[PDB]
Design a protein around this ligand. Structure first.
Ligand SMILES: NC(=O)c1ccc[n+]([C@@H]2O[C@H](COP(=O)([O-])OP(=O)(O)OC[C@H]3O[C@@H](n4cnc5c(N)ncnc54)[C@H](OP(=O)(O)O)[C@@H]3O)[C@@H](O)[C@H]2O)c1
Ligand SMILES: COc1ccc(Cl)cc1C(=O)NCCc1ccc(S(=O)(=O)NC(=O)NC2CCCCC2)cc1
Length: 318
């Protein structure tokens, strides 16, 4: 189930998505993650932003106490939110995520999003006129404090999320660079297959990590509800009939076959169990290219509110 990272560590190819909109009680974060560990997920993806590291952490700690796993067997990811991009604030944010988790280390720590916001207790601080209180932080600086987190052994591996190509290049080109990003976690599914970005990532030994791989939570205002529903796709449905699987499984399996590490969120016990069956069938080259034909360039997570500053990552082609 694993891919070797460029820092020598191993990342399982299928990960469990822990985000659910806040209308869903956080108690389900805990139940769901235990079920995911139980169903066989070994890679668990969260963030400070998701406001669930207490529950996800307990979940993980719970499955260790009952003997179902040891900590060595779990790959846990957290992410540095945008109000702690200032170097001095990077270590304390990771430490805060760990105290909440009640874990000594994270397996992977990402720069969640490349646009910095004003420090403070507000998640997305805005003025009363209109806009987000953007901050001026050198990402190359932010990264260096992220590397210090690897040196301190708080994070076993480090990487980025929602970086475009120039931003990845930027880190690669940085004088003094200690560690490459192990990964770039981005939106990827058959309506936005990220081919160019995926190729660039492979040409530089960076794991692309597909999120919203099942077509997103569709939570407003983060997703246009007029957007097409990925899992209703006729071809994904056909391939599912043909393989006696589901459109979800087709869509997950697509990513495994093109060397993409794939996340799937589910709080449903059935669909949690179903999702691990990505390791029990496979697609033909002809099928896989059928799925390449589904490319719509429909980006579910535009993150428009962050547009404006130069580091808004989706202005560039890729
Ligand atoms: N910037 C970032 O780094 C970023 C951005 C977005 C997401 N993420 C990460 O990616 C994870 C997942 O992304 P996401 O939640 O946006 O979308 P997603 O996992 O692609 O889509 C999940 C949706 O599909 C449903 N589902 C799951 N399994 C299914 C199946 N077998 N059949 C039918 N439906 C199924 C889920 O519902 P049920 O729960 O009802 O089953 C949920 O509504 C998040 O938890 C987070 O960890 C990261
Ligand atoms: C302004 O809001 C808040 C104010 C107060 C509190 Cl108490 C919580 C929030 C909050 O939590 N609001 C974000 C809600 C949210 C979380 C996860 C997802 S997600 O798409 O599943 N995962 C991601 O990382 N999404 C993106 C990536 C980076 C840019 C923005 C988040 C989608 C949306």
């Amino acid at each position: 189930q694993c891919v070797k990272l460029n820092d020598g560590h191993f990342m399982p190819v299928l990960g469990f998505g822990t985000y659910a909109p806040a209308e869903v009680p956080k108690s389900k974060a805990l139940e769901a993650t235990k079920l995911a560990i139980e169903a066989g997920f070994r890679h668990i993806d969260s963030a400070h932003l998701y406001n669930n590291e207490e529950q996800v952490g307990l979940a993980i700690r719970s499955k260790i106490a009952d003997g179902s796993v040891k900590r060595e067997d779990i790959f846990y990811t957290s992410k540095l939110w945008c109000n702690s991009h200032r170097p001095e604030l990077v270590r304390p944010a990771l430490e805060r995520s760990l105290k909440n988790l009640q874990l000594d280390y994270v397996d992977l720590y990402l720069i969640h999003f490349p646009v910095s916001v004003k420090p403070g207790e507000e998640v997305i601080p805005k003025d009363e006129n209109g806009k987000i209180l953007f901050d001026t932080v050198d990402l190359c600086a932010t990264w260096e404090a992220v590397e210090k987190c690897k040196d301190a052994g708080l994070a076993k591996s480090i990487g980025v999320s929602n970086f475009n190509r120039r931003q990845l290049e930027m880190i690669l080109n940085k004088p003094g660079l200690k560690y490459k990003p192990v990964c770039n976690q981005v939106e990827c599914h058959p309506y936005f297959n990220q081919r160019k970005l995926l190729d660039f990532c492979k040409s530089k030994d960076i794991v692309l990590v597909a999120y919203s791989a099942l077509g997103s939570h569709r939570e407003e205002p983060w997703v246009d509800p007029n957007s097409p529903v990925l899992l209703e796709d006729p071809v994904l449905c056909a391939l599912a009939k043909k393989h006696k699987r589901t459109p979800a499984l087709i869509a997950l399996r697509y990513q495994l076959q093109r060397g993409v590490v794939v996340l799937a969120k589910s709080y449903n016990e059935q669909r949690i169990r179903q999702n691990v069956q990505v390791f029990e069938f496979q697609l033909t080259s002809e099928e896989m290219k059928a799925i390449d034909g589904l490319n719509r360039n429909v980006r579910y997570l535009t993150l428009d509110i962050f547009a404006g500053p130069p580091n808004y990552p989706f202005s560039d082609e890729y």
